[PDB]
Symmetry: T
Subunit: 151 residues, 12 copies
C-alpha cells in the first residue's frame, strides 16, 4: 500500500466489508436505543457508500481497476466478519461500529500519507475529507457510550 | 359482501380505540426514551388514522354504514381501555403498544381472509398493506425491548 | 391556584374528541351537491380540531393535570351529543350541524379564556383565544355558504 | 398462459383511450352550477386515466404484446360509445355520464383481475386491483355529489 | 414617435384595474350563498391576477416616461367602472355576473390598449395588453359556464 | 370610533389608503437606495394587505359591513393623499412611509383599547400583532434615516 | 370563423399527433431508447398543453371543439399506421420530424388566419407553439446528423 | 465612560438579553460536554433549544431597541448582569444531571418571562407582554418534556 | 427454498451479489451510451438496495436471520462473479445486467409462489412488487439492445 | 431568412461583449451600494446569457451559423471594451450599464423590425420579450441614478 | 502531540464567541443609509461565525480537548476588545469595525493553519483553510463597499 | 503572491476561452448522441463559469486585477479557437472537449504548484477542487469514447 492507487483499492475492499458489517449491526440490533440507532446505521451506510464512490471513481480516473467482486473485497479487506447474532447488546453493537470506524480512520490516514508522499493532492483531499467525517462519528458514538473519542 | 362490510366496520371500531390508546401512551409517557417514543406515538396515530380512512371509505363505497359515534367504537372494539396513568413504565407502555398492534395484525388477517372468501380483492389489499406495516412496527418495538417479534 | 384552568382544558379535551367524531360522521355520511368541496373540508376541520386537542392536552399535562384519554371519558364528559350516522341527512343539514358544534366550541373557548384570565394563566388564555378566533372565522364561512350572517 | 391477461390489457388500452376522450368532452362542454369544481376535476380524472394507460400499455409490451396505438384501433375495440359534444347537457347529466364510464371501467378492471389472479400475470393483477379501487372510490364520491348511494 | 396614446391607455388601465380590484374585494367580502367556499377564494385569485396586470402596466407606463395615477381620487375619477355599496343580499349568480361585466369591460379596454399601442408601434405594450386580454377572456368563459351560459364575447 | 366594529372599519379605510400611498412611493421613487426600497414597498404593501384581510374578515365575522368602495375608503380615512411626483427625494419618501406607519400604529393602539374595553379578545389580538410589526418597521425605517424610533 | 376553424383543425391534428408519438414511445427499440423513449413523453405532454390552449380558446370564442376519436381521426391531415417494433431509431425520429413539420406548418396557417381576422390572442397561441415545435425539429434533425431545414 | 446605569418593560427586556445570552452559553456547554446514553437524541436537541433561545433574544432585543432602549451587547455585560451562574465545562456529568441543568435554566427563564409579562401588563405595553407570554409558553412545554424524560412530573 | 423465510434469505444473498455485479458494470463501463448507462446503474443499485431492505426486514419480522457477511452472500448466491474488465462493450455489459435481472425475476416468482401457498400475503406482495419493477427494467434494457423483453 | 439571421448573429456578438462588460463592472465595483449592485450584475449576466441561448438557438434553427469564437464576438460587436479600473464610482458603473442596455434595446428593436419585415414571427417575439425586460432594467437603473428612463 | 492545534482551536472558540458578540452589537446599534442591507447582512455573518464555531469546537472535542464554554472564558482568552454599544457610530465606522474583526480572524485562521500543518493535523488544517477563504472574501466585499482595496 | 495572482489570471483567460469552445461544441453538434451531449455542454459551461467566479474573486481579493475584456482573454489564453463547423463528428466534438479539459487540468496543476510554492493555501484549494472535477469528466468522456482516462 505504497501508492495512491493501491491505497484507494484497499479502501474499496475495506469500505465494502465495513458496509456489510454496518448492515449486520442494522439488522440484528436489539436493546434500548434501537429506535434511534437502527436508522442511524442507514445514515452510516450511506456515508460509507459515498466514500466508496469518491475513492473508486478516483481510482478509475487514475488508471486503476477497482476490486469489484465479493471475493476480492473479503480477501483484501483487513476487517473480519462474524455470523449475525441477535443477542449482542446495543452497547456491544455500537462498540463494534466504533472499532470499524477506528480502522477506517487509520486507513484514511495511511491514504492521506501515501498520497501526500507522491504529490497526488486530489486523492490526498479525498482521504482528508473522509477522515474528518468518520472521526466526528467516532466522537459521537463514543459519547453515547459514555467515553472520550480516544482517537 | 356482508362479512367484508362487517370486518371493515370492526376495523373502524378497533382502529378508533387503538388511536385512543396510542394517544394515552403519548400523553402519559414518562421515563428514559420519552423524547424518541413520545413523538413516535404521533407517527403511529397518523398511520392508524390513514387505515381508518382507507377502511371507512371502502365500507362506504361498498354500500355499508360506518360506526361513527364513540359508543359504537367502544362497544364493538375488542380492545379494552383503562384510565391514564403516568406511572406505567416506559417499557410497559411500549409493550402495551405491541399488544394493540398484535391485535390489529390479527384483525387484519381476519379481514384478509373474509374479503378473500367473498372475492373482494380491493378490501383484501387494504388489509394486506396495513398488516405489513403493523408487523414491521412489532419487530422494531420488540427489538427495542431486546426481544424477537414473535410473529 | 389553577384548578379551574385545568378543568376547562380537560373539558375541551373531551369536547374536541367528540367534535372530531361528529365531523367524521359528517365527512362519511355526506350526500348532496357540494360534496366534492365539503367532504375534504371536513378533513381540514378535523385536522384543526386535532391541533387544538394537542395544544390543550399538552398544556394540561404541563400544568400537572391528567387528560381524559379513553372514549368513555370523552363521551361522558363532553356536552356534545352524538347520534347514529344517516345518509339521508341533507348536505345543508350536515353543514348546519357543523356550525352548531363550532358555536359550542367557540363558547367553550370563551369560557376557557375567562377562567384562565381569572386565574392569571396567560399561556392557557392565549391558547383559547387563538382557537376561538379560527373557529369563529369558520362559522362565518359556513354560515355564508348557508346564505346567512355569522350570528355570533 | 398469458393470452387472456394480454387481451384484457389491450382492451383497457382501447377503453382508457376512449374514456379519456369522453372525459375531455365533459371537461370542455360543461356548463352549470358546479362548473368551477367539476371542470378541473375532469383534468384530475384524465391524468389518472393516462396513468393507467401507461401502466397497462407498458406491462403489455413487457409481456411480449403489442398495444393498440391508433385512434381507429381504440375506437373499434372499445366498448364505450362516443357522441357529439353538446353544451346543453346539464351538469348532473355530465356527472352521470362520468359515473357510467367509471362503472364500465371498474367492470373491465374486475375482468382484468379475474383473468390474472392465479391463472395469468400476477403483476397485471395488481395493476388492475389498484385501478379498480380508485375508480370505485370515485364512483362513491360522484354518486354522493348526486345524492345517491354508490350502487356498485 | 409619440407614445402619448399608449401612455394614456396604460394609465386608464391603472385606474380601471384599481377600481376592478375594489369591486372584486367587495364580492369576496359580501359573498353569501351556495358556492361561497369555492368562489370566495377564487376572488382572491382574481385580485392577485388584476394586481399583476396593474404592476405590468404601471411599470411600463413609468418606463415610457409617464406618470401613473396614484391616488384613490384619481382612480375613482378616471375609471369608467362604477362602484355600489356592499350588500350581503346579492346572490352568488348576481355576484358572478357582476364580475363578468367588470371582466368584459377590462377585455374591451385591453383590446383598445392593443390597438393604440399597435398603431404607435409600441410592441412591448401591445404584448402586455394581449396577454392580459387572453386570460381575462378565459375567465369570462369559465364564469359564464358556471352561470350556464356561453362566453358571448 | 365607538366600538370594535367601528375601529375595524376605520382600519379597512386607512389600510386601503395606506396601500395606495405605498404604491405611489413604489412607483415614483428615484434616488440612491431605489434598488432596496422600491421592492421593500412591495413587502410593505403585502403586509398591509394581510392586515386588511385579518381586520375585514373579523369585521364580517362580527356581523359588520366593511367599507368596500374607493369613495368610502377615501372619505373615511384620516390619511391624505397627494399627486405623485418623481422629484421627491428618497429620504422624503421614507419619511412619508414613517408618518403613515406612525398613524397606523396609533390607530391599532386605539383598536386594541376599544376591543379590550368591549371584551373582544380576538379583535384585541389582531390589533396587537399588527401594531408589533408596524412598530418594528418604524424602527428600521428610522434607523435607515439615521434616527431613533421615537415611538 | 376562420380562426375558429383552424383552432379546431389543430384540436384534431394535435390529438392524432399525440397518438403517433405514443406509438413511437411504445414501439421503440434500438440504441437511443433510454433517451428517446422518455423524450416522447415530454413531447406528448407539450402537445397536450397546446391541445388545452387551443381547445379552450375555441370554446372561449364560441366554438365547439371536436371531442370524439372519430372526429379527430377524420378531420386530421395526419395518417396513422399499425404499430410495429421493427422500426429503427432513425426512422422513428424521422417520423416525429414529419409530424412536427406538419404541426409547424399548421401553426403558421393559424398565425396567418388569426392575423388577418385580427384575433391577436389566438395569433399568439399559434406563434408560441410554432416556436417550440421548430426548436424540437432542430434537435431531432441534429441527432440525425441533419440541418433543421425549416 | 461608565458602566450602564442600573435602572420597567425596558429593564426586564434588557435583563432577558443578558439572561438569554448566558442561557445560550450554558446550553452550548451542555451540547459540547455531553456524554452518556441518550447523547444522540439530546446533543442535537440542545441545538434546537439554542436556536429557540436565539429567537427570543432577537424578539426581545429588537423590541427594546424599538422602545428607545439600548441592549446589553458585550460579553462582560451579559455575564455580569445575568442572574444565571456558569461553571467550567466537565465531561464527567451524567445525562440526568445535564438535563436537570437545562431544566433549572428553563425554570429561571420562565420565571423571568412571567416577571416581564407582569411588568409590561402594568405599564400597558401589550406588544412586549405578548413577546413574554409566547416565550414562556414554549419554555414551559420544554420543561414538561425534559422532566418527562427524567420520569418526573413537570412541577410548574 | 421451501418456505418464505428461505426464499427471502436467498434473495438477501442474490441481491447482495447482484449489487456487486451492477457496481462492476458501473465502474468498468466503456462505450457509446456510457453517459446515460453509467448513472442508470446507480439507479438500479438503489432499486436493488430497496428490494434488499424490504426482503431482509420481512425475514427478520418473520423470525428469521438474514445472511449478513460477504462469505454467506457469495456461498449462497446462485449468481457468479468474474474479475472486472474495461474491454467489455456497453452492449455486453447491458446484456450482463439483463441476465442478472432475469435471474432475480425468476427468484421473485419462486418467492411469490412459496409465500402464496403459505398464505403469507405480505411476503407475496413484496415479491410481486419487486417482480413488476425488475421486469419493467428488463423491457427497457432489452429495448435499448434492439430486442423484445423475452420474459 | 437572411436579415433575421444577420440580426440574431449580431445579437450573439453584442450579448457576448455585453456579458463581458457586465462582468468587468461586477468585478471592479467599489463604493457605497456595492453590496446591492455587485450581485445585481450577476442577475443581469444570467439574463443576458438567457437571451444569448434564445437567439443563438433560433439562428441555428433557421439554418444559420452563430459566431462562436471570442475573435468573432469582439470583431462583430458594436460595443467597445476598455481595461478594468477600480477607480470608477458606483454611479459611473451604473451609467455604463445603462449605456450598454440602451444599445441592446435598440438592437432588439432593429431585430423586431427586420423579423417583422420578413414575416418571422417567432424571431420577432424573442426580440420583443428581450426588449421589454432590458427597458424595465433601464428604468430601474436610471431611477437609482435619480433620473427618468429617457428611452 | 496535538497540543498546539488544540490550543489554537480553543483560541478560535473564544475569539469567534467575542466576534459574534461584536457583530450582534453592530446589527443592533446600526443607524444610517444602508441600514436595510447591512443590518440583515450582520445576521448572515453571525450565522457564518457560528458555523465556524461549531466546526472548530467539535474538532477540538474530537481531538480530546475541552472547549472554553463560559462567557468569562471567552472574554478572558479572546484577543478582541468589546466596547459599549453606541447608536451614534456611522455606518462606515461600523463596517470598518467589522473589517478589523475579520482581519483578526483571518490572521488567527492562518495561525491555526500553520500550527496544524506543523503538527500533521490535516483535518484541522482544512477547517482553518476553508474559514480563512470565506472571511477573506468578506473582507474584499466590505472594503469594496467602503471604496477600498482588500489590503489583505 | 505575484505568481499565484498571475496563474489565477491565466485561469480567468483560459476559462473564458474554454467556455467559448464548449459553447461552440454545444451549438454545432450533430450526430447520434446529440440529445445527451448537447445539454451536457451546458452543465460543463456552468461548471467552468463557477471556476471563473472562484478564481476571479480570489484574484480580486489578493489585490489583483482580473482580465475583463475579450481581447485580454484571447491574447492571454493558450487555447486556440477555430470557426464553428457542423460537420465535425460527434465523437470528434467529445475529443475536442477532452483536449480542452486536459489543458485545464494541467493549468490547474500548475496553479496548485505555484500557490503551494507561495504559501497561498486558499488559492491552492481552489485549484485542487477544480482539477479533481475536470479529471473526473476526462474519465467519463474517455469512457464514452471507449478508452481509458490516460491522465
Ligand atoms: Ca473541501
Ligand atoms: Ca416512572
Ligand atoms: Ca456529420
Ligand atoms: Cl420507566
Ligand atoms: Cl457523427
Amino acid at each position: 500500500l505504497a501508492d495512491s492507487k493501491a491505497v484507494l483499492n484497499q479502501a474499496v475492499a475495506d469500505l465494502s466489508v465495513a458496509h456489510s458489517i454496518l448492515h449486520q449491526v442494522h439488522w440484528y440490533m436489539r436493546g434500548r436505543g434501537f429506535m434511534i440507532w437502527h436508522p442511524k446505521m442507514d445514515e452510516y451506510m450511506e456515508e460509507i457508500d459515498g466514500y466508496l464512490a469518491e475513492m473508486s471513481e478516483r481510482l478509475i480516473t487514475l488508471g486503476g481497476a477497482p476490486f469489484s467482486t465479493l471475493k476480492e473485497f473479503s480477501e483484501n479487506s483487513q476487517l473480519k466478519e462474524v455470523l449475525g447474532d441477535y443477542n449482542v447488546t446495543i452497547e456491544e453493537q455500537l462498540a463494534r461500529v466504533v472499532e470499524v470506524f477506528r480502522y477506517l480512520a487509520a486507513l484514511f490516514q495511511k491514504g492521506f500519507d501515501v498520497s501526500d508522499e507522491e504529490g497526488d493532492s486530489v486523492t490526498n483531499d479525498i482521504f482528508n475529507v473522509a477522515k474528518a467525517s468518520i472521526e466526528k462519528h467516532i466522537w459521537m458514538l463514543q459519547a453515547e457510550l459514555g467515553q472520550a473519542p480516544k482517537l
